Each structure stands twice: as structure tokens, then as C-alpha cells.
Amino acid sequence: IVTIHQEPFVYVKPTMSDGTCKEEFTVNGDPVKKVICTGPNDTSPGSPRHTVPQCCYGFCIDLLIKLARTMQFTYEVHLVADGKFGTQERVQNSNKKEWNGMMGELLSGQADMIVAPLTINNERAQYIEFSKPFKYQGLTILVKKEIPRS
Amino acid sequence: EEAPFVIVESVDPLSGTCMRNTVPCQKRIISENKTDEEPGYIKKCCKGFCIDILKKISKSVKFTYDLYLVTNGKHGKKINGTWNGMIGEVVMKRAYMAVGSLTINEERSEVVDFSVPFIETGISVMVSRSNGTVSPSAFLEPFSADV
Amino acid sequence: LLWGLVFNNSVPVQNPKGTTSKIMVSVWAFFAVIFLASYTANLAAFMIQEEYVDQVSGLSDKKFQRPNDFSPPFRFGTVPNGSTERNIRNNYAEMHAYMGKFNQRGVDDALLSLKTGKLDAFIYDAAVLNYMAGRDEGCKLVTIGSGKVFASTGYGIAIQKDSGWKRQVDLAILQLFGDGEMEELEALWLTGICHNEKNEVMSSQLDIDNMAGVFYMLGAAMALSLITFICEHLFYWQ
Amino acid sequence: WVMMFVMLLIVSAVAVFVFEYSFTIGKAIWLLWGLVFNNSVPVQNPKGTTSKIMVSVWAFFAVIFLASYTANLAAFMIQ
Amino acid sequence: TLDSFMQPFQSTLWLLVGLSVHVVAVMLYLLDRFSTLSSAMWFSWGVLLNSGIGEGAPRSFSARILGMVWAGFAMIIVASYTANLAAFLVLDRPEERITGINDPRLRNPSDKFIYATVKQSSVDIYFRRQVELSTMYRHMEKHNYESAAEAIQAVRDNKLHAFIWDSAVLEFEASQKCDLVT
Amino acid sequence: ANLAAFLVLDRPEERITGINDPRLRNPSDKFIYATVKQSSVDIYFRRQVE
Amino acid sequence: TGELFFRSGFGIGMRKDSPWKQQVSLSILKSHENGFMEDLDKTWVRYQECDSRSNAPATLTFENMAGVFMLVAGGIVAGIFLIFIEIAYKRHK
Amino acid sequence: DSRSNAPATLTFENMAGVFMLVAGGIVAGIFLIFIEIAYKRHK
């Protein structure tokens, strides 16, 4: 499973001294899962190349756990290298056009599922079998606000 | 037929078919149970939203079509392993295409298949708007609670 | 004297005969005017910009769970044979059992029954109801909250199993999404007229329900006055 | 406003009528014209029982009236 | 503007406030056997009225606290009254005002509205030569009139819900004869 | 009334309504707005002609 | 601000012609009907709101009180020497 | 008229809502004078 970093869906935190990360509890106090996530560190993998285990927790991975109960399989997630969702372009001005970023790994023998905020579109739907959508969404604009009078 | 998606309207009294921006759909009705009628058919014209999207898709990919309504009830459900409505009409390999107002659920995915949805919807609550306002503690709310 | 003067000369009193007392009471009365007046508007301003709240939280609330234990229960029903009831008959079996008392027919008859007070709630498909709000003469009907949905599903195109037309149509509809003309289609068909930010209409006649607070304050004042009376008397005859 | 003033005159006449059963018509009209506007000027009220309920209902008129004026006046500075 | 007394308060309130005046007058007399009926009743029913009439004041310490809060009760009510009445003068209904061709109200003509144009005129040329606007041209022919003067007289009473014509003729008509509006 | 008038008025200045505000279709140099590179949003804009 | 225009939903994607297609779609859709999705909604996304609209009837606070209570506090202490002179003024005439 | 906001003054239509009751109170107390004076001569 390959998952891109995102704000509301996949949190990422460094582990503790023992190797894993300490378990915490919410307002309800119910345990929150802390599946091991082996992603690269730093901001960009350009200059450095380090792979360090972390634990990632949030919303979508729970769907992975719940789904894995009915379909009995194991998993080992790891974050993508480039860190971008990805599209298609031309390289070396040749007739070959390939994908870069998160999209590419599913294309050539490095994963079998994608669980991430991947938007449906005509181009990507050309050759990939998307299942039913599980969260209707959209795209909007946000701007700064202005302080009112005293 | 449904209010926002498939509106039915009678034909023009002069020509025989109604105006443009629609497709002719012909429906079936039979006489009383005591004496029945031989293929008694009446044609009307259907227009709306799903009709327009179907026309667009037909112009996009070349194939023809002809629309005919249904009479055996409503949307449809499972009773004693049998199906009515659009699901019933398509389960017997006699329709090959169902359009209009079809929801999506668990059972129906086992008989027919489905494409990508285009309108978000679901179950909602609709109530009359109460005439009046809300102010349980109006007289104390403004000003301040410490002065 | 001063505690009564802070509020519209309401209490008749006897006035001290000094001079510095005179200047002090004058300046306090000035403090007076502003304070009272300021309170009066601010209250007017607050009540101008109210916010209407519907008398229900959601389908998961107890108000739809045990109707028998309240005031004459909500008369609510649904059109049968649809996909809506199948959802109901699988999570709220007892509520579905209570449903059959009314068992409405069609749509327009249910709308008319709601307009005449026979019914007071309704459950049906989200898409139809949202469109039905903008067509009625006047605007006396509104969905709960901000149009929130409780079971996120969608319409579609149902075709027979195992044909390449599945792939063709599925890839084709995303083309229609691509060019954004469905925005034009929505602006032509499913757009609505009223319901611009729910400006609310008017409070009127202020019936007993709200003044309960001030009446309770009056009763509490009477009670504490009686307690002070009895305490003072018992301490006094000793 | 003239309909208000003429009713001042008629209720002053009624007060004169009541007195038959240290009071002067100028004092009575001063009292009334005071109570109509926030009873600002201190005034020696009459001792007549019925005149007192009459001026009470007059005060009811005064309070309703004044409040409406204020409210209404806002209506005009924000539209 | 409705009625002065009835518009801002329900008839129930008048009874409840009125009866309480006698009620709150009662224990005042009772509070005088701690350590003047004609006086006590006037004291309370006057202060709510903001009148300038009164003779004496209570002396027992027990009533002293009750009177203080009683006065504050009056100020809130009269403040409450002057507040919402203000609400009436600032709220109005909308709806009827339509917004030209873009309004959904004029693209699916129901059997409640009727358009109107002068027959054999400039307006007819603009519609019939359009394509996507044809959906309203079909409803258009069934009611069109003979001349301008007749049409205006037909809309003063409830016989036509809308009219379409030039502004340079309509604008003067609305300004001088001010029953209608653009 | 004056203090009442001040406490209820704000004079809403302007907000970006959507994709129809002329503050975006005819861009100026007083606005700088961007998206995420090589992303879903970028595909939608490039293919559109107008 | 504004209203969303480009509308679609996120999805789970696999490679073309994999044997896991026909089974995942049935399960994921089944979650919506049971209500499992809504339980996760409250815990993670819709829990904190500083969303008092825009009108925001302002509960006026002690910041306003300074402009008036400063004045009243002046009178009690600005009259004390006014008291001193006037009682002496009586002794002067 | 113009300015569809329409801030309108109140007029004589509201006069009846106030003057009639208070003027009615005037004639309501005329015989109350007779009643109360009778009480003084009664005892």
C-alpha cells in the first residue's frame, strides 16, 4: 500500500525510544491504531536518502484495517518517494511518455492498491480500475479575513 | 417518470409529435381485465435532465436508441426471489439499459452492475419551518455577565 | 434612592438636603442614562440578528426513537416500495414498525398533508426534496440543518452485466465532467429560487415560553423575601 | 400632534369637572405635559381619586407612545 | 402595521402580568405584621407604569428587598417591548421580484404564469429566431394581445402575471401611474 | 438610535464569489494565487480552452 | 467562501484486471448503508468549530466599561476637596 | 414612491388603537365618579 502525506487523512509522527510510538487516547479514550509506516524523512529526497520507520495514524488507514478483516490479507505500507500525486508528461523529446510521482509505482510492479485522496478524472481513469467513491468532495477557495471594529 | 429527472408531457395537438428538445417515448396500456386489447400502444414525448444527458452520451459515442416506459409498478424490490420495475425489466435480458431515478445499494450490485455516479444524494429529513424564533434566555444574553 | 434612580425614576423617594450629595447624585444619574440606554439598544441589536434552529437534531436523535413518551408524537411517514424503507427496515426495525400508522402515498399528497398540519416530518430521497424547496409558492419548507445527508449514495446508469459498453460509457461520462457543461445543465434545471442564507422572518407576540426566566426570577425573589422575613422574625423575638 | 393636544384640552376639562366632588388648571396641564414626557419636572399631583386613575391611564398612553417613537425612529436611520 | 396593543405581545401576557400586580401587592400587606391596603396596591401598579404618582414608601425591612427587584422587573419588560417592535420595522418578504431571463421561474412555464407581448412586433422576431429559448416561445403564442394600450389595462387587475415590452414605454408608465413597477 | 445603528451594520466589502469574479478572469498584479504542482487541479485548468 | 463547482469523490484504485476488483467494491459500499462511515466522521473531522457566522452579535465586555466607570470614579475623589472648601466657605461668611 | 426598502411612517390608522381605549377610559370613569360619591354618602 502506497500513501501520500496529507493533512486530514494520514498524520505522521516519529517513533519513541523503543522503536514504536507511545499509545494515546482521544476524548472517548478509545485506542487509536498506530500501524507501522516506513516512509522517508526530511522535506525532499533529493540531497539525502534515508528510510526511517514511523507510525502514521488517522482516517483512511482505519478503512484499510476494517476492509482487511473481511478480506483476509496482510499489508505493509510505505510512503511514496517523490511526494507528489503525479501526472504524465514528455521526457527526452522521445515517443515514450511515462508517469512520475505517486501514480507511477502502481503502474510498474511496486504496489497493488492506493488509499489516499486521489481525485477521479478522465486522464487517470483511462487505464486504472477505480472502485466506488467513499467520500463525495469538491474544491473551493479560502482567503484571509479582516478584523472588525472594537 | 419522476418530477426533476423525467417529465412526461402530451404531444402537440396539430402535428402528432410535440416540439423539439425531446425524444419520443411510447408507453403501453391495456383495457379492462375482462376484455383485453391487442398491442394497444400510445406515444408521448419525454423531456428533462436524464433525457438530455442520454442524448449527449449518444452523440458522444455513435449508437441509436428508442425509449419505452414501464407499467409494472415502481422502482422495484426483491420479493420471493423475483424483481419488478426497472430491475425486473433488465434482469430478464429484455431491456439492456436502465436510466432515470435509480438509487444504489448492496443487493442490486449482485444482479446488475453500475457506472460512476454523477449526483450526490442520500436520505434526508424535511420538516415544516416553524413560525417564530428561538430565544430561551434573550433578556440576559446581551450586555455582559460580569459587569 | 440611587438604586431606584438607576432605572427610570421609578421609585418615589425623599431627597437629601445637602450639596455634595446633590452633585454626586447628579453625576450618578448621568451614568445612568448611558447605561440604560446602551443596554436598550444592544438588546435590540442582538434580537435583530437572531438565528433560527429547527426542532430536531437528526435521524439518530431520541426524538425519533421513542415517540410514545412525548407530547402527541410526530406524525411522519414515507412513500413505500422505495429504497428508503429498505434502509429503515434494517437498522430501526421498531421505528419501521411504528412507521406503518400513516403510510403516505406519492409525493404531492404528502406535501399537501404537511401544508395542512396532518403531517409534521418526512423522509425521502435527498435530491428530490432539495429541488422541491425552490418550487413552492413562498418558502415555508426547508431541509434540516444545511442539507446534510445521512447515507452518502448516488444515482447512476444501470446496464446488463458483462458488456464492453460498460467501459465505454464509464469512460465517456468523465468526459462530460471534464468540460463543465453539467454546470450549465444544473443552472438550467436543478437550481433554486429562494433560501438565500436563511435570513429568518420575525419573532412575534413573545408568548409565555420566553418570559419564564423573568417570572422565575420574580418567584425566587418572593421566596427569598419570605425566608428573610421568617429568619428576621425568629432571630428578633429571641 | 394636534389630535394629541386637543385630547390634552379635553382631559383637562374632565379634571376640572372632577374637582367639584390648592388646585389650578395651569398646574393640572403642567402635570399632564410633564407626565407625557418622562415626567421630568416634579409636580404636586391632585388629591382626586378618579382624577388619579385618569392620569394613570394617561401615563399608559404616554409610555406606549414614547416607546414607539423611539423604535420607529431607528427604522429611519438604517434604511 | 397591525394593532398597537396586539402586534408585539400575545393576549396571554396581558392577563399574566396584570394578575401578578394584585399578587405582588398581597404579601406586601402581609409583610407589615413583622415587627395600609390602599397604599400598597397603588405602589406596585404605579411603578410598572412609570407614572409620577405616589404617597408613601414601605418601612418594614422584609419588603425592602422585594421592592428593589420589583422595579428592575418593570424596566426589562418595557425594554423588551421597545426592542422587538423595532424588529417589525425592518423585516419584509421577497420572492415576487424576478430577475429576467436567468430566473428559473421563466424557463419551465407552469399553468400559474402567463407572459405577454404585442403581436407581430419586434419582440416576436427576437424569440422565434433563437434556438435554446424556444421552450418559452411555445407558451408565448397562446396569450399575446392586440396593442399596447389594452395590455396595460389588463394587468392592473389580476389577469396577467407578467409583461414584456420596451423600457422607454414602460418606465414612463410606472413613474406617472405608480401602481406598477419595473 | 445612534448606538443602535452602529452595533448593526458592517458594509460587506467584497469576497471571491467563485470562477465568475472578474478579479480572477482578468488577473492583476495585486493577487498571487497558486496550486500544488503536478496535481489533480492542474489537469483541469490546462485542458480547458477558454 | 463560494460554492464548489468541480464535484467528484475520492476512490480506492487497483491495477487493471486484478482479481480483487469484484469483492472490494461490494464491501466498501456496504459500509455506507450500515453507518460505519458516519461513526468515523465525528471522531476525526467535525469536532471543533469556531464558526459564529459573520453577523456575530457582540457581547460587549469590560473594555466598554472603562469609558464610564473612570468618570464616576473621578467624582467621588474630585469632590472631596470640594467638600473641604465649602464647609470652610460657611465659616468664611 | 421609490426605494423599495420602503420605510413608512405610522399614521392615524394606529390612533384608534390607543386613543379609543384612553378616551373610552374617560367615559368609563364618568359614572365611576357617581358610584364612588355614592359610597361616601352610603356610610
Ligand SMILES: *[C@@H]1O[C@H](CO)[C@@H](O[C@@H]2O[C@H](CO)[C@@H](O)[C@H](O)[C@H]2NC(C)=O)[C@H](O)[C@H]1NC(C)=O
Ligand atoms: C407498494 O407495493 C405493494 C406490493 O405489496 C403494492 O400493493 C399492491 O398494489 C397493487 C396495485 O393496486 C394491487 O393490485 C395489489 O393487490 C397490492 N398488493 C398488496 C399485497 O397489497 C402497493 O400498491 C405499492 N404502493 C403503491 C403506492 O403503489
Ligand SMILES: c1ccc(C2(N3CCCCC3)CCCCC2)cc1
Ligand atoms: C430616556 C429615553 C428613553 C428611555 C427608554 N426607556 C426604556 C423603558 C421605558 C422607559 C424608557 C430607554 C431608551 C430607549 C427609549 C425608552 C429611557 C430614558
Ligand SMILES: *[C@@H]1O[C@H](CO)[C@@H](O)[C@H](O)[C@H]1NC(C)=O
Ligand atoms: C412467491 O414465491 C413462492 C415460491 O417461489 C410462491 O409460492 C408464492 O406464491 C409467491 N408469492 C408472491 C406474492 O409472489
